[PDB]
Amino acid sequence: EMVDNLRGKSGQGYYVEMTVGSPPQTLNILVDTGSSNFAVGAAPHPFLHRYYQRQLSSTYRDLRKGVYVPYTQGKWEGELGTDLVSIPHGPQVTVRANIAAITESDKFFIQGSNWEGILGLAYAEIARPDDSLEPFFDSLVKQTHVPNLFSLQLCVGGSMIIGGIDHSLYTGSLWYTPIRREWYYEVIIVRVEINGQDLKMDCKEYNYDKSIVDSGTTNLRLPKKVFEAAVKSIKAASSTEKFPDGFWLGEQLVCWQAGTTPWNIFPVISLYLMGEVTQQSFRITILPQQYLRPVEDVATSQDDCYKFAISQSSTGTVMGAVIMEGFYVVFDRARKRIGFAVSACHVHDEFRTAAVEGPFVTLDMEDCGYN
Numbered sequence: 490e491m492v493d494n495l496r497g498k499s500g501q502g503y504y505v506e507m508t509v510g511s512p513p514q515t516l517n518i519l520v521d522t523g524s525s526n527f528a529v530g531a532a533p534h535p536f537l538h539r540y541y542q543r544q545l546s547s548t549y550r551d552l553r554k555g556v557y558v559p560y561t562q563g564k565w566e567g568e569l570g571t572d573l574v575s576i577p578h579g580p581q582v583t584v585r586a587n588i589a590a591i592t593e594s595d596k597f598f599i600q601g602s603n604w605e606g607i608l609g610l611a612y613a614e615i616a617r618p619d620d621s622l623e624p625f626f627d628s629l630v631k632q633t634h635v636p637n638l639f640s641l642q643l644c645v646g647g648s649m650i651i652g653g654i655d656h657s658l659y660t661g662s663l664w665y666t667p668i669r670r671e672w673y674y675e676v677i678i679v680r681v682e683i684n685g686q687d688l689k690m691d692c693k694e695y696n697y698d699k700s701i702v703d704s705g706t707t708n709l710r711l712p713k714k715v716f717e718a719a720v721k722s723i724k725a726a727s728s729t730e731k732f733p734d735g736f737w738l739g740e741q742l743v744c745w746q747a748g749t750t751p752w753n754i755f756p757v758i759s760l761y762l763m764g765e766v767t768q769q770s771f772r773i774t775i776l777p778q779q780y781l782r783p784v785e786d787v788a789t790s791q792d793d794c795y796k797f798a799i800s801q802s803s804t805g806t807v808m809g810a811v812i813m814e815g816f817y818v819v820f821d822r823a824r825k826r827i828g829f830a831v832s833a834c835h836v837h838d839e840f841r842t843a844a845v846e847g848p849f850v851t852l853d854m855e856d857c858g859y860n
């Protein structure tokens with residue numbers, strides 16, 4: 490009943506059906522591990538099919554406080570309150586939770602995305618206005634018996650499993666990396682390889698100034714230095730074809746005659762994550778089918794066209810949806826760790842498969858955390 494409860498794509502977000510208020514108002518809500526506010530469109534907007542009508546909910550309580558939330562893409566402002574919330578295809582519970590009723594926004598809502606709100610699944614430390622606004626999942630755990638864990642299989646569609654791990658959603662072993670600090674889902678990258686060749690940087694550079702696991706961001710985003718080095722290595726591996734600079738910056742598409750995308754000219758990318766034991770790690774391996782994001786457009790449909798879904802960041806590494814796709818990712822809040830396994834909807838062709846493998850050991854005793 491919880492399997493296949495997500496819909497959406499990397500480019501516009503994955504969303505789960507929820508209800509808010511009494512009687513229940515159905516809304517589609519984007520699942521975002523990169524923020525901590527639960528918010529819903531609560532006034533008309535050109536891109537909203539529907540919105541939260543507070544006047545129709547007898548259980549709504551106004552908190553008499555405004556809130557402003559800026560993301561890397563988009564921003565909104567609204568009014569804080571609480572109300573009853575359910576998840577039809579999740580655990581069969583009703584919880585009273587904080588809700589931001591979005592009354593104005595800028596470049597937040599996306600035309601044709603099919604979602605009307607956002608579920609920030611990260612910790613109170615990054616909630617707005619401040620950490621006294623209890624996030625939804627904290628409320629869910631406090632008010633119900635639900636174990637303090639959820640998992641995401643992003644495949645479009647996929648699954649969010651609340652309170653547990655569904656073995657039918659992965660194969661092989663789950664490998665865990667520590668949550669370094671409970672704010673974002675902050676992790677530590679210890680090594681990066683492109684087609685098995687080490688980028689050969691001080692590992693702190695990979696985590697400058699943090700590294701996060703963020704289902705709400707489309708791309709793998711990398712600190713400038715790491716991004717520049719990664720692109721150089723990917724260009725070199727793929728040098729049998731030459732692409733415009735705009736492609737490498739994510740500003741223009743690359744297109745091939747339908748069915749002829751040359752996957753084998755593009756390298757695999759391995760991100761090594763800190764293990765749960767000193768100087769041990771494991772790797773997750775990303776295929777080009779993950780980091781070249783298809784852009785569906787009937788107009789270009791004589792071809793398959795893609796955007797390069799690795800991009801630069803000035804706020805640290807963001808392991809976005811294109812990285813999470815094809816892995817089963819367990820947000821094990823109870824044990825302050827994040828587990829990765831190969832997903833039942835993994836990417837592969839006949840030559841290569843995405844992987845989660847270990848253990849690996851390092852001689853260098855440097856702490857890779859930036860601080």
Ligand SMILES: CCNc1cc(C(=O)N[C@@H](Cc2ccccc2)[C@H](O)CN[C@@H](C)C(=O)NC2CCCCC2)cc(N(c2ccccc2)S(C)(=O)=O)c1
Binds near residue numbers: 559809
């Ligand atoms: C899914 C829509 N595509 C997209 C979204 C975001 C993004 O900012 N996602 C936020 C949620 C969201 C979802 C849908 C529409 C708009 C926004 C995430 O919460 C961001 N998480 C972190 C990084 C964050 O900013 N947390 C905030 C939370 C509030 C408190 C303060 C911290 C970034 C980029 N990408 C992008 C686009 C433009 C510029 C930079 C990145 S991309 C193209 O690189 O994937 C692309």
